[PDB]
Amino acid sequence: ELSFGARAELPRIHPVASKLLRLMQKKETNLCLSADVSLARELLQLADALGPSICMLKTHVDILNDFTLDVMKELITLAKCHEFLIFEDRKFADIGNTVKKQYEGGIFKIASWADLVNAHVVPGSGVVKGLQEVGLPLHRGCLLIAEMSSTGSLATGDYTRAAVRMAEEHSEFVVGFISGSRVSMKPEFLHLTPGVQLEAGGDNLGQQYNSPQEVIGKRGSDIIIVGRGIISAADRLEAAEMYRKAAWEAYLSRLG
Amino acid sequence: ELSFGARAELPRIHPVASKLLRLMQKKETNLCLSADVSLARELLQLADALGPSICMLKTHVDILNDFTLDVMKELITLAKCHEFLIFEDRKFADIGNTVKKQYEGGIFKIASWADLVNAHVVPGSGVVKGLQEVGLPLHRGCLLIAEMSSTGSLATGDYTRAAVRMAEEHSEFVVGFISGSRVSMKPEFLHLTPGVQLEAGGDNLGQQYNSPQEVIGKRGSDIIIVGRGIISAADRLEAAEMYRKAAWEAYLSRLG
Ligand SMILES: O=C(O)c1cc(=O)[nH]c(=O)n1[C@@H]1O[C@H](COP(=O)(O)O)[C@@H](O)[C@H]1O
Numbered sequence: 334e335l336s337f338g339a340r341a342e343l344p345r346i347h348p349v350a351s352k353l354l355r356l357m358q359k360k361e362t363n364l365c366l367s368a369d370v371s372l373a374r375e376l377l378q379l380a381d382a383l384g385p386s387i388c389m390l391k392t393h394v395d396i397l398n399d400f401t402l403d404v405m406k407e408l409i410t411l412a413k414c415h416e417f418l419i420f421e422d423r424k425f426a427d428i429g430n431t432v433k434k435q436y437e438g439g440i441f442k443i444a445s446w447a448d449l450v451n452a453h454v455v456p457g458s459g460v461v462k463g464l465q466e467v468g469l470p471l472h473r474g475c476l477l478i479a480e481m482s483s484t485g486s487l488a489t490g491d492y493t494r495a496a497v498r499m500a501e502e503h504s505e506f507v508v509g510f511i512s513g514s515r516v517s518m519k520p521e522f523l524h525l526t527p528g529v530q531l532e533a534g535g536d537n538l539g540q541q542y543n544s545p546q547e548v549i550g551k552r553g554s555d556i557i558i559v560g561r562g563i564i565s566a567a568d569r570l571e572a573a574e575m576y577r578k579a580a581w582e583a584y585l586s587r588l589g
Numbered sequence: 590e591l592s593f594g595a596r597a598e599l600p601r602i603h604p605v606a607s608k609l610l611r612l613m614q615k616k617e618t619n620l621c622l623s624a625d626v627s628l629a630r631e632l633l634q635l636a637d638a639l640g641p642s643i644c645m646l647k648t649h650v651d652i653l654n655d656f657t658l659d660v661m662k663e664l665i666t667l668a669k670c671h672e673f674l675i676f677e678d679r680k681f682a683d684i685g686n687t688v689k690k691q692y693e694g695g696i697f698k699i700a701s702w703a704d705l706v707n708a709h710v711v712p713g714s715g716v717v718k719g720l721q722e723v724g725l726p727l728h729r730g731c732l733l734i735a736e737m738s739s740t741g742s743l744a745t746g747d748y749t750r751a752a753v754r755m756a757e758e759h760s761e762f763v764v765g766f767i768s769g770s771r772v773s774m775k776p777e778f779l780h781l782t783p784g785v786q787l788e789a790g791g792d793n794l795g796q797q798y799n800s801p802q803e804v805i806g807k808r809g810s811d812i813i814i815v816g817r818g819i820i821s822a823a824d825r826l827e828a829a830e831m832y833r834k835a836a837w838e839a840y841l842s843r844l845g
């Protein structure tokens with residue numbers, strides 16, 4: 334098993350994956366903040382304060398009440414300052430012809446500011462082809478949703494295998510997965526795992542939590558995605574540091 | 590098999606489904622326009638001119654370059670004038686806690702103007718529970734994506750059966766499906782079928798077309814969803830009338 338720094342140099346590595354893996358090793362962080370807030374001011378204050386602690390800030394641009402492209406300009410300034418990627422968790426899931434417009438256009442112009450986006454594999458490989466026609470020219474990357482954290486998820490068995498095949502057949506653009514575990518044996522591919530908290534539990538709408546030690550250490554994922562475990566805490570900086578140290582040590586102990 | 594008018598009166602019918610079925614029978618239309626345009630002025634001119642020909646106007650609010658809530662106010666005025674429902678084809682596909690905010694909030698406030706939305710069933714029933722916590726109080730309906738029109742679709746076999754079970758277990762809010770065929774034997778549930786053109790063919794990004802006669806007449810669906818077959822035509826009114834007459838006669842001939 335290679336370190337994040339060594340994976341950053343693999344011959345078939347995507348440039349976006351390389352950039353991410355380099356800053357993970359430099360900063361000793363494999364934490365992605367899920368910035369699930371409705372106010373631009375809170376998004377930007379979290380990005381600035383937690384920037385040093387995170388490898389990635391995950392957005393849902395569509396829940397931001399005061400979205401403007403200028404808010405995202407301010408977010409990019411912080412991403413460059415503190416060295417983290419921006420991941421818009423848009424979960425594209427339409428035919429190729431539709432998702433290309435949803436990615437490039439509308440009010441959000443997601444491709445103009447998001448290093449990474451993700452997509453469901455249920456519509457077939459046209460979802461990836463449509464996205465890649467915008468994303469490849471704009472030097473972006475994509476994650477495929479191979480497993481989900483929610484109760485009743487149908488992303489199991491043959492579905493997960495189909496997501497891995499689709500990623501591996503589109504390595505020019507697909508850099509990894511949203512998954513609960515290592516699903517690809519190819520080290521060029523990032524595994525990002527949501528549904529993470531230090532304590533056992535869930536929410537009232539099907540979210541299920543596992544710990545950083547379980548998903549990084551036992552299940553072999555690379556990055557933890559954490560929302561409420563940080564966002565709902567009083568001191569979001571110390572919460573981010575707890576999650577960072579948990580995920581980083583779990584990674585180190587798997588490397589041996 | 591019951592007429593649309595008789596289905597509108599079924600004991601377990603959802604109010605949104607009833608409203609739709611009534612106006613389908615009154616206007617002799619089972620055509621949903623897929624208004625896949627980037628300009629508000631073109632969206633509203635199509636809604637006004639084609640309103641009399643359609644039972645439903647399907648939006649992708651996220652590809653509209655000049656979206657404002659006022660554009661949607663003007664769209665509702667036309668929907669009320671010409672009697673059609675508004676369906677935002679957002680394909681919600683996240684955990685319940687996330688989709689409730691994506692449905693109610695952000696810039697688009699989808700629940701404030703959309704009669705219908707749709708959701709993928711891949712995350713489990715939490716996607717429906719989250720949406721229904723916004724949609725039930727706002728008297729809205731939801732369609733579940735049981736089958737998809739695109740090449741390589743994984744929405745087959747057990748997946749389609751899971752979508753039908755999920756719809757049937759959430760009949761307070763789920764009024765039907767996006768499907769290629771009749772998938773539910775319960776007549777209270779609408780079947781809407783995209784991937785429709787009069788001529789054989791497809792697009793370059795995995796879209797596959799079948800005719801109105803095939804999907805309404807042979808496959809037993811209720812409503813055709815048509816985008817480019819109308820939108821790319823020079824005379825979009827006559828194109829809409831051709832699709833309306835095709836879908837309506839296919840429906841009548843199945844009734845006998
Ligand atoms: O794509 C994701 O990040 C995602 C996939 C999934 O399987 N589960 C999942 O929870 N998510 C997202 O990750 C975040 C989880 O947030 P918390 O449950 O608050 O930690 C939310 O923004 C979800 O939309």
Ligand SMILES: O=C(O)c1cc(=O)[nH]c(=O)n1[C@@H]1O[C@H](COP(=O)(O)O)[C@@H](O)[C@H]1O
Pocket residue numbers: 427428431623625647649678707736737738739767783784785796814815816817818
């Ligand atoms: O939800 C849908 O309407 C949808 C599901 C699906 O399986 N296939 C499908 O094409 N659609 C949508 O229906 C429309 C099809 O448009 P045309 O291919 O131009 O007729 C697009 O807006 C798609 O996003």
